[PDB]
Structure 1
């Protein structure tokens, strides 16, 4: 007989856990937790993204589901080496989170001419969808 209990997976605050800065000067760059100061402050390092090593509050960052093996208290040179070895910036770009993020600056960078072209293209696509939907 089964003894099923739901797991309810959570993003743990841990050494090696990759963060995403949402408030501050970075505002969208990737960093990794190096050492845990207390329940609300952590030490992060974003050397590939350009984030200086600093003590940040947990309310200014959002944890990502990416995790890589990083020693506790590893310096900037050590963090940057394990970051490229695990290819953190490649796994992040393949996630739907970054593809949803990268989509929204692309729409914000649309010119007035490009906004007209999107209108035309969506009208051609809507013709094919309506034809396919009305025959099934």
Structure 2
């Protein structure tokens, strides 16, 4: 060929820098960066800007994120907060397809009954133009 070929398997590595969305807990949908892994199943995470305390947490309650940033290992809350704000983690997260789908769920949950009648009207106004386009 002779560029051989391997797939390969792309994964989210459990490292120092890996920001992780907390899914079950008092936090439940806040970002926190991993500073030091304990043992294969347990991590150390601090989200100083999001406001989750530096805690040793089980891995069933975290979701690994595609986003990373160069943090030194076991760096304290002040060092984390500076390296976090430097790399701009919160912007890279808010500008995600996933963060948008979380913001869509919480918004459509926080919708009113009048705004439910409005969105219904507008979707049918949109639907008139798209069905004219689907015909041609």
TM-score tier after normalising by the smaller chain length: over 0.9
How many residue pairs match? The answer is 135
Alpha-carbon distance between aligned partners in 1 of 2:114 and 2:83, rounded to the nearest angstrom: 44
Query: How far is the alpha carbon of 1:68 from its aligned partner?
Result: 0.1
Query: How far is the alpha carbon of 1:7 from its aligned partner?
Result: 1.7
RMSD: 0.5
> Structure 2: which 5+ runs fail to align?
none
TM-score, normalisation: structure 2: 0.98
Alpha-carbon distance between aligned partners in 2 of 1:113 and 1:22, rounded to the nearest angstrom: 32
Deviation by residue 1:98-124 (Cα, 9 ceiling, x = unmatched): 011111100000000000001000000
Would you identify which runs of 4 or more consecutive aligned residues in structure 1 move more than 3 Å?
none
> Structure 1: which 5+ runs fail to align?
none
Q: Is residue 28 from structure 1 mapped to residue 10 from structure 2 by the alignment?
A: no
TM-score, normalisation: structure 1: 0.98
Alpha-carbon distance between aligned partners in 2 of 1:125 and 1:8, rounded to the nearest angstrom: 41
Query: How far is the alpha carbon of 1:2 from its aligned partner?
Result: 1.6
Query: How far is the alpha carbon of 1:8 from its aligned partner?
Result: 1.8
Alpha-carbon distance between aligned partners in 2 of 1:15 and 1:7, rounded to the nearest angstrom: 23
Query: How far is the alpha carbon of 1:15 from its aligned partner?
Result: 0.5
Secondary structure at 1:4 match in 2: coil
